[PDB]
């Protein structure tokens, strides 16, 4: 589950049945170094 | 209106009816920080 596979819209307070997990950002390891 | 929503092809000298605006790049605030 990455940012190029999913898209952001709204918040977790609207979707019925949303699970809490993590989404990997490919920009973070490139910018940390 | 961002780069992840629009694609670049040609320039503003060809397409009729193009207007000037600013496009927000999400990479820039992350790179500056
Ligand atoms: C994560 O999702 C669960 C699912 O309902 C929620 O209860 C919780 O408040 C969310 N946030 C957390 C665990 O920080």
From Swiss-Prot, chains A, B:
Sugar-modified residues: 20
Phenotype for residue 4 to H: In strain: Alpha/B.1.1.7
Superkingdom classification of source: Viruses
Role description: Subunit of the fusion protein that is processed upon entry into the host cell. Mediates fusion of the virion and cellular membranes by functioning as a class I viral fusion protein. Contains a viral fusion peptide that is unmasked after S2 cleavage. This cleavage can occur at the cell membrane by host TMPRSS2 or during endocytosis by host CSTL. In either case, this triggers an extensive and irreversible conformational change that leads to fusion of the viral envelope with the cellular cytoplasmic membrane, releasing viral genomic RNA into the host cell cytoplasm.
Name of the protein described by the UniProt record: Spike protein S2'
Species lineage: Viruses, Riboviria, Orthornavirae, Pisuviricota, Pisoniviricetes
Gene transcribed to yield this protein: S
Residues of the full protein shown: 1115 to 1147 of 1273
